[PDB]
Amino acid sequence: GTSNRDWWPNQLDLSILHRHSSLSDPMGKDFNYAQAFEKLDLAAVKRDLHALMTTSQDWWPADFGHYGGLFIRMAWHSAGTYRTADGRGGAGEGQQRFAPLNSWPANANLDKARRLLWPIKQKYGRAISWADLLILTGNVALESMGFKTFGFAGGRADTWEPEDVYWGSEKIWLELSGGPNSRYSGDRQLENPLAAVEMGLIYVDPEGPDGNPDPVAAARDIRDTFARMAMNDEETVALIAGGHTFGKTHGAGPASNVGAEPEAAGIEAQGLGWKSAYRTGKGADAITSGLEVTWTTTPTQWSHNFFENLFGYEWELTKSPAGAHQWVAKGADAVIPDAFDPSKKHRPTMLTTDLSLRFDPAYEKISRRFHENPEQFADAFARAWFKLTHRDMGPRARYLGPEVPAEVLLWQDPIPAVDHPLIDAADAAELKAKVLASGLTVSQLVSTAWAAASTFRGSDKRGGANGARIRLAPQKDWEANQPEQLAAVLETLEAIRTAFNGAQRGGKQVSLADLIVLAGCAGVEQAAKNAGHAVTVPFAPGRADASQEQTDVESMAVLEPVADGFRNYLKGKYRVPAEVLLVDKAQLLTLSAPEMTVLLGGLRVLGANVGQSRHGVFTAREQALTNDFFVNLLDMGTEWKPTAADADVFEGRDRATGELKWTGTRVDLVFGSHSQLRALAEVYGSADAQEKFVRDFVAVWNKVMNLDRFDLA
Amino acid sequence: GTSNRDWWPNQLDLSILHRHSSLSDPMGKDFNYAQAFEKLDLAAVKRDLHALMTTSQDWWPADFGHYGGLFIRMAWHSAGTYRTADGRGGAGEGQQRFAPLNSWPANANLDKARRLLWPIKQKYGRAISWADLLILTGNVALESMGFKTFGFAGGRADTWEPEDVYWGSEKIWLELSGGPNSRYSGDRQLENPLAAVEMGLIYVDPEGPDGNPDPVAAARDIRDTFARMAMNDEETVALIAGGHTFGKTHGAGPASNVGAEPEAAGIEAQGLGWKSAYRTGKGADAITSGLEVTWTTTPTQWSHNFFENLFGYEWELTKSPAGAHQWVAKGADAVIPDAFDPSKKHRPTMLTTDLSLRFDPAYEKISRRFHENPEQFADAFARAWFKLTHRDMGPRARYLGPEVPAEVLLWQDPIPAVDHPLIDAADAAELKAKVLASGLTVSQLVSTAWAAASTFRGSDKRGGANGARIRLAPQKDWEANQPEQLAAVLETLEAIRTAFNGAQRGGKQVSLADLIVLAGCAGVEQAAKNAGHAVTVPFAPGRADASQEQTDVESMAVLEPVADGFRNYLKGKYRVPAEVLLVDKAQLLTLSAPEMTVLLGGLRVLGANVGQSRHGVFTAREQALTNDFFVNLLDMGTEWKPTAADADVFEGRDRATGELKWTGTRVDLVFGSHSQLRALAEVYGSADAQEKFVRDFVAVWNKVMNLDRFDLA
Ligand code: HEM
Ligand code: HEM
Ligand SMILES: [Cl-]
Ligand SMILES: [Cl-]
Ligand code: NA
Ligand code: NA
């Protein structure tokens, strides 16, 4: 059946903005997962999970009689898809249970792991999400095997369809670099936003880069991909060596014995995949990655044996029974237990990427320190495990249940608690009048609030105006934020703030975070008045100001908007067309297509463009809140053509005279070209639509202003 | 970016069930288009459209100084995509303005026609939909040129994204038959549900079948496609000759001059396409189809000159300036006006498909009668034009405005007026108790009501339980409806009805249509009580009973369910797997994926299967409304394998013992296989889900019962 994507494979895709509708959700529209979770008997769930660890099922027998290593890998892979570049992936949506991740080659046999958990899921129902369950199971696996975890938070609501993520452009699973759709160019430079070396891997190839078994070059891939997952060297070594303290890999026979992944399997497979024709196809005969490595002498118990083995032997390159590259300890005795036959022991083995932790010089120093100081290792691994499995959960306000660690961690972008009365409505009116009396213009107030609030992304719930980080490094210096203009607004607002706060009684004070937002609201009000409309814009106080010391400058860098169509900004030339980057930003903002449309057309007329660019400013009454963008964009009296200087800038001329009326970019003109966007623009450009436009603009403006307000959840 | 559809191109696509979300709709959740339309000054809109007909724009100059022919073609094409097989296509959703239909080669230059109407659309805003405006414009065209239309109804609400329609499997526009994705097999048998001879055409190729200019063979393709659009020979001849009374074709130069269709065009083309390098690119130089024919001596005035020319000349095969096959009158004088140069005239010309109306012997008889009696022609054309443009609008209850024709037409599947008091809540309770006391079983009652209500399709708003047509030919004899069992139920209900209605005063009576639905409601309540749960199922009276004489038996044939997964029914073996046909049915029923899931699982345990098949009946308490379908389907204690006799029937055995527990079809087991469906089944299969399951089942049951209830809109 031929589709629109077949005929016009490059047209923009707006269905990414309309996922996750109430239509696909089986829960009623008022269901609140946090409320369900908070009444869960978490202790009961944990007891059942502890029981499960050693309850072997014959359709996928437990190695060593204990599923803990399998479950650790399952939770690690749940979390492991995370990319800092866009915040997409991670554990927080339970996406391992849907395509494509349920069928990635690196997730082979995790279908079995998930299926082992169905009885517990069934028993507790909506009070524990799959998303929470995968991580809690990993925690219980660790605790069961003698490792004390740093804590756990619930609150990951389940989702009900696949998330739209760019995972790469290869058309072949596990394609090595340099193909027609390579993710690598130059000196092994991985394309942003990707954080894995091959399509269908988590981070790196366990055999080495492009299959070449060099530990030193593998380390370079490890460092790069883990950094793209928000992890530094100490965290990386702790996580790899911690995880590989447990369990084993599976490669008992040739890979050609393994059949179709879950999404390809027949209907009778009932959602499982990778059925194997090798011997019994399971247990002792399992094939998952094709590697056959068991790291420690006690694979079901926390130990310090990983680093003892890593440093205590020299290593020889060998092949598994499936033909994959791996390492075996020279001259060792058979000291590692077999998973099924108590009469069999094996020599210590390692992956190429495990050897990276000894042969990369920076990792070697950490590894040695961990070998010499095992308590350091344990604490680092516990902290890293917590970070790995919570890094996409957002502010601490979203963390639920009795095991949330009290310690505030820098990567959580912490926001101080408020410990004073908040401004009320009379105070808000007094502050908005002060702001408008200061001389700050509508363009300045809207631009500033926009810059502050629009760093939010719903993928990992980072960013937003809470914290007033716009005033700190690095946000204060981002080009899109117009650092010189920004500084002047902030000084004026800080003086208003100081004067208001110094006049108060009791402890009442306004934060700068709240004042930035409220000043934006006053801008919008003023713009509506400029257009002859009375409009009140809603404002909710309660934001606090974070410090520079609470603000990791290197972690904040990934929030920098290099493309922000809402301010007609593009920091450089990119291969993806600007209108696709606009839709991508709208998705991170949680906007629908109508919301993106209304928002952009209003911002253009309020003066929110970077540098005061006239591109898309289709009005003769700038700083007035009108639907002029739409009415003028849709006027067939104007003809548009690209400029000779720049094919991405367009000139709009009177059709009859030739006279220049406007200029615009691709992000402006898409609204007149894309047949779905244009249908939305037509609603707002109609004669009956001015009041609708104003009211829909205020609603979407407020939405953006509140995106990070989980304190009001 | 590689997508799930790239990796698994045959997996089932559930996003067809989740279109039209409140996310994508720019109007607020409370917008009601009928309430807007009812206050539109339709007379004023028509005056504006009348003026537009002779107000030429220089970017697309009006042939003859009159846009009427262009607008008639536009309205005809808006309607002309309709297929009776599934009800999909037609003018009722305004889909011409979205992909793919906006860019079909047969719709070339209708982009210009729609753009001409933006000022009016803009002026009247949400009070007239695009969908209604396209049709209205064609009526105003006709009226402006001296033709009396049959009437007009508003009420077609606009849509905001493309509909999911199977238009064929070809990957090339206008592909000739016999390719690797041919839509023809056997002796020129067009595959169902398609109603056009090539991809991107409306009905037929104007040059002849596969480009062969034989009018006799063309006539076969005309008859077949028009019948697949619900039009008979009289109506077909009336429509083709009626439409070709007006305007002209456009083929002034070679087609290689014409550029990209709108969806492929550059951003600067602002939604238009087919830009032409031939001379001025427009007006006297226009190229649309590549044909260059002007049919009558007065292309801007209704006449009977089409038939005067068709029968008063002999015709010679010729070529247009673009090389297309067309016909010219032998020996004729230059009597046809030129569209722009008042000093130039031309000989009469015709398409191959126009000549079909004289050289097909059946058409020739109708065409001669129309030639001799042009008043017969005018009335047939007006009736056909109304039917064409309204055929997908649904029951007459949906028809809005002051020009609705009072004549009731058989093709409307008309429902008599109700002229008596309706039953109240106490009456409904009395009737449900009588029905249950009669001995009719839960399975009988549920199956009967399901059979009656589930003929609805949202594509053209035909079918449903209103009318009690289940008791008439042909519904009473459809295999899926189990004719002998259905007859026994209907006799019992008719006796209850007679007794209740004979006891009343005051003229209160209950229709059989209502009692069929009410009795199904009693069954569902009884099933709930069998499970230990008291629930009330909502019921809304006001359906009426249609007669046999008010029922077109041949038009009702396309509503027969040949595949109904909700009753585990497949009338024969099809190319398309049964789970794909289930999703197709659910889309016609307007169900989401959660709604489809709940409904199916509940119908399985109520005894709704055709023939009392055990397939999918995963319960030991049949006729009790429980979630047993889901709990048993999801039990990993059961292993599934296809049977040797039939690869589409599966046995479920105990994994440990081999003992046979169940049988199922593809439609049952897809809920345990597809990863999104399985996620939904898991919710309803959980230990906390009995209350939810019952509530959600009752709600979707009531939804299905009420699909055709536009009297309650
Ligand atoms: C450079 C990074 C890493 C690579 C290349 C890697 C590679 C793999 C491979 C190839 C397997 C075998 C799959 C199979 O055949 O069953 C595996 C197993 C496993 N990995 Fe990793 N791993 C990495 C990091 C991690 C991390 C960070 C953790 C957790 C903290 C982890 C925990 C596990 C465990 C527990 C197993 C054993 C599974 C079982 O017992 O069934 N690994 N690793
Ligand atoms: C066998 C069925 C039919 C065929 C093959 C056919 C074919 C065409 C073609 C090839 C064009 C020329 C497009 C262009 O070059 O501008 C056209 C024009 C047109 N057709 Fe048809 N047609 C059919 C039925 C109808 C029907 C049912 C009507 C309306 C009742 C209709 C009304 C028109 C009008 C009014 C024009 C002139 C457009 C103008 O003036 O711009 N046609 N036809
Ligand atoms: Cl994601
Ligand atoms: Cl459609
Ligand atoms: Na994420
Ligand atoms: Na339709």
Which domains are delineated in chain B?
1-167+373-407 (1.10.520.10), 168-372 (1.10.420.10), 408-564+689-713 (1.10.520.10), 565-688 (1.10.420.10)
CB B565 within 8 A of CB B581: yes
Q: How many residues comprise chain A?
A: 713
**Alpha helix positions (H), A438-504:** 442-453, 483-502
Asked if B322 contacts B333 with a C-beta cutoff of 8 angstroms, the reply is no
Catalytic residue among A18, A50, A77, A346: A77
B77 is catalytic: yes
Contact B379, B363 (CB under 8 A): no
The torsion angles phi and psi of B82, rounded to 5 degrees, stand at -60, 135
B78 lines ligand 2 (CB under 6 A): no
What is the spatial distance between Cα A442 and Cα A701, in angstroms, rounded to a whole number?
14
Contact B334, B346 (CB under 8 A): yes
Of all protein residues, whose CA lies closest to atom 16 belonging to ligand 1?
A: A249
Ligand 2 atom 7, closest CA: B206
Contact of A30 with chain B, judged by CB distance below 8 Å, is answered with no
Mutate to test the pocket of ligand 2, among B198, B234, B244 (most ligand atoms within 8 A of CB): B244
Residue B223 near ligand 2, beta carbon < 6 Å:
no
- Nearest-10 Cα torsion for B22, B25, B27, B28: 10
* Ligand 2 binding pocket includes B353 (Cβ within 6 Å): yes
DSSP letter at A276 equals: B
Q: Which amino acid is at A152?
A: F
| Cα–Cα dist B457/B88, whole Å | 9
Portion 590-609 of B in contact with A at CB < 8 A: 592-594, 597
CA-CA-CA-CA torsion sign (B529, B532, B535, B537): negative
- How many Å apart are CA B452 and CA B429, to the nearest integer? 21
Task: Enter the tokens of residue B662.
Answer: 């169940």
C-beta atoms of A688 and B268 within 8 A: no
Is B644 an interface residue toward A (CB < 8 Å)?
no
Residue A186 alpha carbon to ligand 1 centre in Å: 29
Q: Which amino acid is at A432?
A: K
Q: How many Å lie between the centroid of ligand 1 and the Cα of residue A156? A: 24
* B247 within ligand 2 shell (Cβ under 6 A): yes
Active-site option among B18, B20, B66, B77: B77
Tell which residue, A273, A160, A226, A255, has the closest CA to residue A391: A226
Round to whole Å and give the CA distance between A482 and A609: 10
Ligand 1, atom 31, lies closest to the CA of: A243
Rounded distance between C-alpha atoms, residue A696 and residue A694, angstroms: 6
A60 contact residues in B (CB cutoff 8 A): none
Alpha-carbon gap, residue A45 to A122, rounded angstroms: 11
- Give yes or no for a contact between A511 and A544, defined as CB atoms under 8 angstroms apart: yes
CB contact under 8 A, A168 and B2: yes
Contact status, residue A389 vs residue A135, Cβ threshold 8 Å? yes
Q: How far is the CA of A90 from the centre of ligand 5 (A)?
A: 5
Resolution (A): 1.7
Q: Is B17 on the interface with A (CB under 8 A)?
A: yes
To the nearest whole Å, the CA of A233 is away from the closest chain B CA by: 31
Q: How far is CA A486 from CA A471, A482, A542, A569, B355, in A?
A: 9, 6, 22, 16, 74
Token pair for A494: 């800080």
Q: How would you write A626-653 as a 3-class SS string?
A: CCHHHHHHCCCCEEEEECCCCCCEEEEE
B244 is in an annotated binding site: yes
Find chain B residues with C-beta within 8 A of A33's C-beta: none
- Mutual angle of helices B215-227 and B233-243, in 10-degree steps: 110
Q: How many CB atoms lie within 10 A of CB B6?
A: 12
Could you tell me the two tokens for A172?
Answer: 């072949």
B679 touches chain A (CB under 8 A): yes
Contacts of B254 (CB under 8 A, 6+ apart): B278, B287, B321, B322, B323
CA of A466 relative to ligand 5 center, distance in Å? 20
| Protein residue with its CA nearest to atom 28 in ligand 1 | A243
User: Do B546 and B468 form a contact (C-beta atoms < 8 A)?
Assistant: yes
- Locate breaks in chain A with C to N over 2.5 A; list the residue preceding each: none
Distance between CA atoms of B645 and B667, rounded to whole angstroms?
18
Q: Whose CA is nearest to atom 4 of ligand 2?
A: B206
Identify the nearest ligand to the CA of B460 by its number. Answer: 6
Nearest-neighbour CA in chain B from A536: distance (Å): 20
The DSSP annotation for B24-46 comes to T--S-TT--HHHHHHTS-HHHHH
Distance CA A640, CA A628 (A): 18
**For residues B217 and B203, what is the distance between their CA atoms, to the nearest angstrom?**
14
SS3 B224: helix
Distance from CA of B710 to the nearest CA of A (A): 22
- Across the interface, whether the CB atoms of A682 and B121 are under 8 A apart is answered yes
Exposed (0-12), middle (13-18) or buried (19+): which is A328, by Cβ within 10 Å? middle
Chain B contact for A672 (CB, 8 A cutoff): yes
Site from A23, A59, A181, A261 to mutate, B interface, most B CB atoms within 10 angstroms: A23
The ligand 1 site (C-beta within 6 Å) comprises A 63, 69-70, 72-73, 76, 203-204, 206, 222, 239-240, 242-244, 246-250, 288-289, 291, 353
Interchain CB distance below 8 Å, A22 and B17: no
Euclidean distance between CA atoms B74 and B65, whole angstroms? 17
CA distance B63 to B70: 9
Q: Is B684 in the pocket of ligand 2 (CB under 6 A)?
A: no
CA distance A71 to A137: 7
CB contact (8 A) between residue A27 and residue B683: yes
Residue B252 and residue B208: Cα distance in Å, rounded?
20
Contacts for B396 with CB less than 8 Å, ≥ 6 apart: B153, B404, B408, B412, B414
How many CB atoms are located within 10 Å of the residue A491 CB? 9
- DSSP assignment of A485-539: HHHHHHHHHHHHHHHHHHT--TT----HHHHHHHHHHHHHHHHHHHTT-------
Tokens of B258: 């014409």
The CA-atom distances, in angstroms, between B128 and each of A692, B32, B134, B403 are: 17, 12, 10, 15
| Residues in a beta bridge with A570 | A563
- Cβ neighbors of B424 (< 8 A, separation 6 or more) are none
